[PDB]
């Protein structure tokens, strides 16, 4: 996660993705619908 | 790059939500308790205890992927070639080989 | 034309903004779902709550845009609709759901516009907005004279090829003047929509009515009331609540704009 | 503002001084502004309340009843203090609730 490679496939067109984002679903905010969570950001844009 | 996909969320009052796990590349699922989420009208439902919500989210590729994307390659070996210039009994020739 | 028909069977929706102008929370017309940067060129992409158009008739007017107010769709003019940043930015262009700006450098992203009662509406959300530098030089401002480099940008196309967002039935939309007390009692008045009711008054009778309904011995503070007749799909956004641990979808709407190799 | 010259109130209105006597003008037409226009919360009398962007001078001003615009510019370094650990230029949809004083509507 938050570096290069943190999500691959083995093709352009494969359904086979690997994904390591550390994603984690956080509590919303009270009186709220809205879904929080917290999660790496994409390595190839850091990498960029 | 990924992005985060994430479908409405689930509000169950007066009961408990529950999910399933996926087979999805980076996925995850919660249920949090004592929710009393409102809308623009009011409350969002009758009961105001013994509330749940489920969230859920997975991780795919992006349809940008088609465009901007970075290729991890093996390299091995190579082949040379080369663009030689001859002057040949006064004729300036250039010819293309391996 | 013929792109804008995926909105047919949609509404815009209402939902949850964190900064409604006023440093302070609301629920708003104006919200953002999305930002996407994708492009290499600086371009924004916004998702927005919003239908730019779309009249409340169906029909297809681009200077026209159609928000939720209340209950109802309404209409208002595309040219009171803004996007900001540091600076008020450039549309490039709309379609439905999706609008093009070129933004000067910020921290924040905010969007809005004049509604039919001549009311500003705005939502405001934290964004850094930096493009990256294109070829070894950090310039400010396109050239008369340089070199071509490769970029990614957003066409204006609205063939949108394989890019769908999920649509479905909304859930039930809580109102409480729904529930007006008259005589000491709830009268769950249903203006035109199907509502459901429950009361915490030994409600036996609770269930849907598509009539006017006098609730006796009971009292407002003991009822909720939702309106239930709702036809038309709505985005499947994070903020807007699912029916059924299950989903309804009946639509994916394309989406314009796709990502492209320029220079 | 909010006051007419005829010491009536009405919130739609502000009066100023034209040579020796005062004068209307439409509150619409007030404006704030520092690096890039301000939001006005409320306005009373002589007090204006606005939420100001960062910047190192603030004006004011309004078109007057001869639509000649008005304004006025000072020195002001305007840089709002840091609530909690993280520099942030506006409020999330998710976090944590601090302590801290602002003008009431009052």
Known sequence: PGQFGDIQSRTPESKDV????????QRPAAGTVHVPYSQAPSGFKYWL | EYKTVIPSPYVKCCGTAECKDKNLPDYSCKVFTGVYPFMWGGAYCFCDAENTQLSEAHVEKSESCKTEFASAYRAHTASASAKLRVLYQGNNITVTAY | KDNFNVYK????????????????????????ERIRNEATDGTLKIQVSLQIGIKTDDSHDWTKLRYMDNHMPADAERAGLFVRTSAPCTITGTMGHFILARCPKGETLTV??????????????????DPPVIGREKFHSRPQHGKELPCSTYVQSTAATTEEIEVHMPPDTPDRTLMSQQSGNVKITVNGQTVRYKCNCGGSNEGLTTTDKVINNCKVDQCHAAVTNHKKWQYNSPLVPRNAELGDRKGKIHIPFPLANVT
């Open chain 1, 18 to 25: 690997y994904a390591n984002t550390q994603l984690v679903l």
């Open chain 3, 9 to 32: 069977a949609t509404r815009p929706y209402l939902a949850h903004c964190p900064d409604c102008g006023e440093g302070h929370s609301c629920h708003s017309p104006v919200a953002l």
């Open chain 3, 112 to 129: 809005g516009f004049t509604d039919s009662r001549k009311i500003s509406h705005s939502c405001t959300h934290p964004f850094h907005h």
